[PDB]
Design a protein around this ligand. Structure first.
Ligand SMILES: COc1ccccc1-c1noc(C)c1C(=O)N1CCN(c2cc(NC(=O)c3cccs3)c([N+](=O)[O-])cc2Cl)CC1
Ligand SMILES: COc1ccccc1-c1noc(C)c1C(=O)N1CCN(c2cc(NC(=O)c3cccs3)c([N+](=O)[O-])cc2Cl)CC1
Ligand SMILES: COc1ccccc1-c1noc(C)c1C(=O)N1CCN(c2cc(NC(=O)c3cccs3)c([N+](=O)[O-])cc2Cl)CC1
Lengths: 430, 430, 430
């Protein structure tokens, strides 16, 4: 924990130094350095470098001006190595990849990718880290949803180091499943000599099962590089303080940070704020109800957002662009979880699914139809298992949100009770 | 379009002239002529004539008085032929039948008819035009719901011109189904030599399928004859202007019209207004949500209506009757559709049916159970097809309501979001 | 009716006299006598006596003091016999047992008992009178839920008077089922020579079926002894007036009564009030919606109650205890029913389960999926029967609540429309 916080704090400290360095190299003002569009281009450069460049936006003469700078990849690689105390440091690089993955997950529906791989486009909640490269870092493997893994494996199915790459990914997915039955099916997909349709079929089944018997996907709050750089510069020492991705740290960092974004004429700056907030806390596929309660303001579905992507294309013109503050703070904080919720146990039930009339009064007599009717080889075990589950079943018992003043997470608030971010479009009202 | 508007405008112009003529024949005042109960009796007469009569209500000495007039059928037939520029004109006659059908559909549940034919009384949404005679006009065929057709065909199943009548009706129903599978079943019902139980069974199946894979039923705004007559008299030329049943025209006509109704002591005049508004725009089986949004005031379920039928029986006494204005205007207008919504395509999905927990917080983890579990000869194709459909699936993409000032339907309003008119009674709370 | 009211009034009159007698024997003040915790201990004594005692709470020196008195069982038995005009009187004894049963049903979830017997812990609505002894009184048999009966029978399955005890209980349960099919299964469980697993399996099936095809369980408003005693003393004659358990009487009795309860520091006195109100009208497993409408204030789920049990354990200290008035009155009253609602008939349907689009507008097209899809040896009859039922189906047609001024129940109020009391806990959100 102390040791984990040590190295995590070491990599964020490295990202910070690099960004500051890069900001002076481009002679950007502090405000300009803290424009989300500038941070992404700088993030893109160091990721691409492992000549290159992209749009860098300057406040010039009361107007926003675009410029596509170019840097030698050898020079960037040097600047990254040296901001990270000599070492090559692939850790912070993958941390900035996961940040981009989270923003992608929050911005774009990847249905076109899903249908090509033979997957149902309603599996987006399984798709964390799908834009993240195949065989990324260990942290990248940790963060990838069940569907991402399944998608990657079918791309394979569609040179004996190909076999080990296949096996590694089978094992990654297996480690994500919380039931032995699902785990046993992955062994059957892995054990296959010369994989094909039966494996494809199996993986589609597993993906669908992961909608109810959800897998263990890690969630890591990853912030634009400018946030870390701004913190280092302002006097914060991530090596002395340590740092965490799943605890209070990132919430408390955003609470002391101010990030900006370029805003188009049609766009609501609050809606841009929601998007980058979601991305920051890897919350694209969270229940909107909890996202709201945590933030303090309503987290609206994608379809009701009066905004488009964070990045401003080379096509559109700068003379209409204004720049707004991003609202990334929260009312409460909550630990980020690796868990997919309850899947196992089935230790009794404890509840009520029908009523017994006491009074002679006209009314309907409510009962939980799917639950009552429900009770009337590894494939059928899974079927029976998800047939047993109910949307009403509670996970994370005893756990709750925390006040920002609660450093040590001592007094959990359990919240009382629109769930899907991608539920509202021209085809479906979910 | 111009040609369609020409003839439609010609038949409404004919109905108009006839009503004016009839109003002078009975020496009725303009107000009296625009009493819905008077219009229906005049409508009844010309329909029955193809001696006869019915109750005609006059404002006499500060009180409402009833009188059952009588006209020779030869004289009425002459008056109809001559108001329609010589010609026999069966078009306007069937237009006044469809108006009566729409009012019937809005007023009376026809469960007793449904059970005799072996049909489920919950199929009322399939029952448009069930009170309309068998083998009416082409417009009558167009307006009949899937269930009406099925009901008519079973009545048959329960003299070789009987065979062609059977075949015509099979083809009418077939032309209504939007899926080839349903269409293929109708061919199997039609092809049958000496039809019986298997056909009955097939038709019950098709009817049930039309609740999810809905058929193409035409909808035509048809107004009481007084509305058209009042318009002709006031200076409107339906031949010069043309006229439409599915566009803006009828909405804009009601906007410039004022209709009255006799009201009983218990009845709410607003609730009478809702009923005749629904009837007018053939909306008895529309979603209450859209009916409301269009009208601007809430369209309440049948069970919550403090009113009975428009027609006042010969039994009840006139001394308690008062007369109220009918409120038939709307906030918005919308094109009337022939479509039954989406049934085909299945081009991907694009949505979200489960959540992936990001935060360690106590809550249930919502998922779309029926949809996820769903994925686990022409009869089974249909079963699989309606098993694939979901209540959340969106039809009429891109289409919306219009401001009354928007003649050419240029700026569609897409509405944001109690659905069943016949959902609330002593047996069921739908 | 007059004869039934005669004897019922006779037993409540007996309970009343006994309580008054007991109150003087303990030299308690009227206020002290009307403390719910005192009444229960006195109720416990006469039930246990058929030496003994329990905690009796006195208001001493501005503080609440506890004392565990002791009485000879021979003396209590004498006091009960003599307050009941000589006779042994087992009737009032079982009436005080049913009162305790109702409070138990309202206070404690009995999942631990359910799981041992192999039953689903979600069957609590079937569990009326489970804490009531096996083979209680006839009134006790009447009041026991389907699940209680099933639980009792499995305890058996897990000395030929054992056979008759088995058969009596099979017949009790049978008399509760409203469908012949369920009744026929009980005959098959009863007819079994040397019962075992097949019977266990059968009874679990029947219990589950009783969640939809609900059985006839009697409900009797039974009040703490202090309420009856207080009434006798104040001048009310239950033999001259008669008395009822299912009519207006108990509501009207509570309306003229004032009961108290000891309250802990954390507890909301209103929430204590809800609990004892529910217990009093045997309403633990009623729909919360009707319980509310009747009472006039919201009847909250168990999980949202800031209270624990009525009885104060010997462990906890008296110096923190305060005493509050219990709010047991109601806005309306309603007859208590023996019925389990509709299970039979299936006389047509009359309703609407889908919509037919009239307007070309973007929206989803709602349909009742489970109902439409539903239509696609005694075990299968039951399956088909509960598959036919719907949560939306209305029972007790024409019946409603009454104003407290409406003695003869002349003007029924039919109510317009959270249902489960035990639906909210750390495992489930129902
Ligand atoms: C205690 O104050 C300081 C503390 C340190 C440095 C400067 C100050 C300081 N010097 O002047 C003022 C004024 C200051 C000040 O009050 N703050 C507010 C908090 N700030 C902040 C806090 C955190 N994390 C956590 O606090 C925790 C994480 C886990 C349990 S607590 C992170 N992060 O981990 O990323 C970033 C930032 Cl920027 C630092 C600046
Ligand atoms: C433009 O005005 C006139 C226009 C014509 C005649 C008189 C006037 C007129 N002369 O004086 C005043 C004052 C007038 C006036 O303003 N109105 C309001 C609209 N009225 C009306 C409009 C329609 N249809 C449509 O407008 C459309 C349908 C499709 C696109 S537009 C229908 N219908 O088709 O059944 C019935 C009626 Cl009654 C006619 C009278
Ligand atoms: C009519 O008044 C009296 C009537 C009798 C005795 C005294 C009074 C009386 N003497 O002075 C005042 C003042 C009085 C008074 O107004 N009440 C209110 C009602 N009280 C009461 C009413 C009932 N039942 C029913 O009323 C019905 C049950 C069914 C249809 S009506 C029950 N119960 O059956 O358990 C308990 C009680 Cl305590 C009795 C006292």
């Amino acid at each position: 924990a102390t040791e984990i916080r040590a190295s995590v704090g070491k990599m964020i400290d490295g990202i910070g130094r690099f960004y500051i360095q890069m900001c002076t190299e481009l002679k950007l003002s502090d405000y300009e350095g803290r424009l989300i569009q500038n941070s992404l281009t700088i993030e893109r450069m160091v990721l691409s470098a492992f000549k290159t460049g992209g749009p860098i936006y300057r406040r010039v003469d009361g107007k926003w001006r675009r410029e596509l700078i170019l840097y030698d990849k050898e020079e960037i690689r040097r600047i990254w190595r040296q901001a990270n105390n000599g070492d090559d440091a692939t850790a912070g690089l993958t941390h900035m990849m996961i940040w981009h993955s989270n923003l992608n997950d929050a911005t774009y529906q990847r249905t076109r990718a899903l249908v090509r791989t033979g997957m149902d486009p309603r599996m987006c909640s399984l798709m964390q880290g799908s834009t993240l490269p195949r065989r990324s870092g260990a942290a990248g493997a940790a963060v990838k949803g069940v569907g991402t893994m399944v998608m990657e494996l079918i791309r394979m199915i569609k040179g004996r180091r190909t076999r080990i790459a296949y096996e590694r990914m089978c094992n990654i997915l297996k480690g994500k499943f919380q039931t032995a039955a699902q785990r046993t099916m992955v062994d059957q997909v892995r054990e296959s000599r010369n994989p094909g349709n039966a494996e494809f079929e199996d993986l589609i089944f597993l993906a669908r099962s992961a909608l109810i018997l959800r897998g263990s996907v890690a969630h890591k709050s990853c912030l634009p590089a400018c946030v870390y750089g701004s913190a280092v510069a302002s006097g914060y020492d991530f090596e002395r303080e340590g740092y965490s991705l799943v605890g209070i740290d990132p919430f408390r960092l955003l609470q002391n940070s101010q990030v900006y974004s370029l805003i188009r004429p049609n766009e609501n700056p609050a809606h841009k704020s929601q998007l980058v907030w979601m991305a920051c806390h890897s919350a694209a596929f969270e229940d909107l109800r909890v996202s709201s309660f945590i933030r303090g303001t309503k987290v609206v579905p994608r379809g009701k957002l009066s905004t488009r992507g964070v990045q401003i294309a080379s096509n559109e013109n700068m003379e209409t662009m204004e720049s707004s503050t991003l609202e990334l703070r929260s009312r409460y904080w909550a630990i980020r979880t690796r868990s997919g919720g309850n899947t196992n146990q089935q230790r009794a039930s404890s509840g009520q699914i029908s009523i017994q009339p006491t009074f002679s009064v006209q009314r309907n007599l409510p009962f939980d139809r799917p639950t009552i009717m429900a009770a009337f080889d590894m494939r059928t075990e899974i079927i029976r298992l998800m047939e047993s589950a109910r949307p009403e079943d509670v996970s994370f018992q005893g756990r709750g949100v925390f006040e920002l003043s609660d450093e040590k997470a001592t007094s959990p608030i359990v919240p009382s009770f629109g769930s899907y971010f991608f539920g509202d479009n021209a085809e479906e009202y979910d």
